[PDB]
């Protein structure tokens, strides 16, 4: 078929997906994070859990991801 | 029925918005003026960029009044407001447009340019 | 306005708009009538639904509505039938 983007992150409100942005001029890696509002269905996950998410069609004004699996419990 | 201190809307685009009547011209002791009469006035309110500015002392012809006028056939015409047009000595308008209806008595007054530019002459 | 074919297009647009308005109005009336008849289980609720389905399909053929909108309207009646 085709593959949808997958991320792993920590719940910050019941997902933060911290990544690195290498500096264009100096070459140093700098940590940056982006919050991915995701769809949890039956409110299963809680704050601090490390979760896996997958990209979906728009679900609301800002939700574009579905929580597929919980990796590390809060 | 316009007298000293009567404030009038200006029905042209010359820059003046409201004027205050300084004098009714046309003889000693004249107290009131009506449609077609000429007044000396001062511009109390002006719009930006107009030729006529606030504080200027100008001459204007009355073009509509609340008192209105009576015609020889026993008919009358009355308006909802008092409005005038700033003029030069040649009785031509200082502005280039006329707003709202004006009375046909202006034609007898020989304000033909104002009559021509008016959108309605009643 | 200025161009000869633009001037003609004003007339043909007005003719099409008049026909389209009539057919849209009739189609919407039948859909509303069929919707009401379901919410009360009338004896002829089947005839009113069949009429509404007939007119919605004719509007889609006339490009008055999209086929996707006709399908969406058709289902709403038929599930409730």
């Amino acid at each position: 078929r085709n593959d949808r983007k997958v991320y792993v992150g920590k719940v910050v409100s019941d997902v933060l997906v911290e990544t690195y942005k290498t500096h264009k001029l100096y070459g140093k890696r700098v940590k940056y994070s982006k919050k991915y509002k995701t769809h949890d269905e039956n409110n299963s996950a809680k704050l601090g859990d490390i979760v896996k998410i997958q990209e979906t069609r728009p679900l609301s004004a800002t939700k574009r991801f579905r929580l597929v699996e919980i990796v590390e419990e809060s | 029925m316009i007298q000293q201190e009567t404030r009038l809307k200006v029905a042209d685009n010359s820059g003046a918005r409201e004027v205050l009547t300084i004098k009714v011209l046309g003889g000693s002791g004249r107290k009131t003026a009506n449609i077609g009469d000429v007044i000396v006035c001062t511009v109390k309110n002006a719009t930006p960029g107009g030729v006529v500015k606030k504080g200027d002392v100008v001459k204007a012809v009355i073009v509509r009044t609340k008192s209105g006028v009576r015609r020889n056939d026993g008919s009358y015409i009355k308006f909802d407001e008092n409005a005038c047009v700033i003029i030069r000595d040649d009785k031509g308008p200082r502005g280039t447009r006329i707003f709202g209806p004006v009375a046909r008595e202006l034609r007898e007054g020989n304000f033909m340019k104002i009559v021509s530019l008016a959108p309605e002459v009643l | 306005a200025n161009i000869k074919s633009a001037i003609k297009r004003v007339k043909t647009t007005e003719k099409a708009e008049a026909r389209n308005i009539s057919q849209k109005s009739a189609m919407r009336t039948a859909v509303k009538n069929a919707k009401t008849a379901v919410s009360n289980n009338a004896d002829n609720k089947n005839e009113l639904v069949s009429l509404a389905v007939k007119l919605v399909d004719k509007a889609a053929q006339s490009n008055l509505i999209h086929s996707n909108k006709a399908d969406r309207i058709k289902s709403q009646l038929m599930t409730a039938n």
Partner: protein, 134 residues
């Protein structure tokens, strides 16, 4: 500084400034606003011609006061020996400050608009607006 300091606060180069600021501005009359255009010359009108004394040097250096087409007032030097300028003259003004004359940052172009060429010039005439003799 450290690499981390540079990442937090990158380098910033000094901003260069123009030696002829009156040439790099326009004026929109309709909107009554100033533009930025970088013209090589500007037209202007002479408000006051005259002379001025230099700062070691000693002379009577001829100049004019000019209102440029962008409504900016400048002092412009008149090069060459003799000129035909006076009040209300229409002049073309170019860049180039004259040392020893404080407050004069521009030059009048000889041989353009109303300014005449230098009379009797025979060497470097194109700098002084003089046609070729004979």
């Amino acid at each position: 500084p450290t690499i981390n300091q540079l990442v937090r606060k990158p380098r910033q180069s000094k901003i260069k400034k123009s030696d002829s600021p009156a040439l790099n501005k326009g004026f929109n009359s309709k909107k009554k606003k100033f533009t930025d255009l970088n013209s090589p010359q500007k037209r202007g009108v002479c408000t006051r011609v005259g002379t001025m004394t230099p700062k070691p040097n000693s002379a009577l250096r001829k100049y004019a006061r000019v209102r440029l087409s962008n409504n900016i007032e400048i002092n412009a030097y008149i090069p060459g020996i003799g000129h035909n300028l006076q009040e209300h003259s229409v002049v073309l003004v170019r860049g180039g400050r004259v040392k020893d004359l404080p407050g004069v940052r521009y030059h009048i172009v000889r041989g353009a608009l109303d300014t005449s060429g230098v009379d009797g010039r025979r060497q470097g005439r194109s700098l002084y607006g003089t046609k070729k003799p004979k």
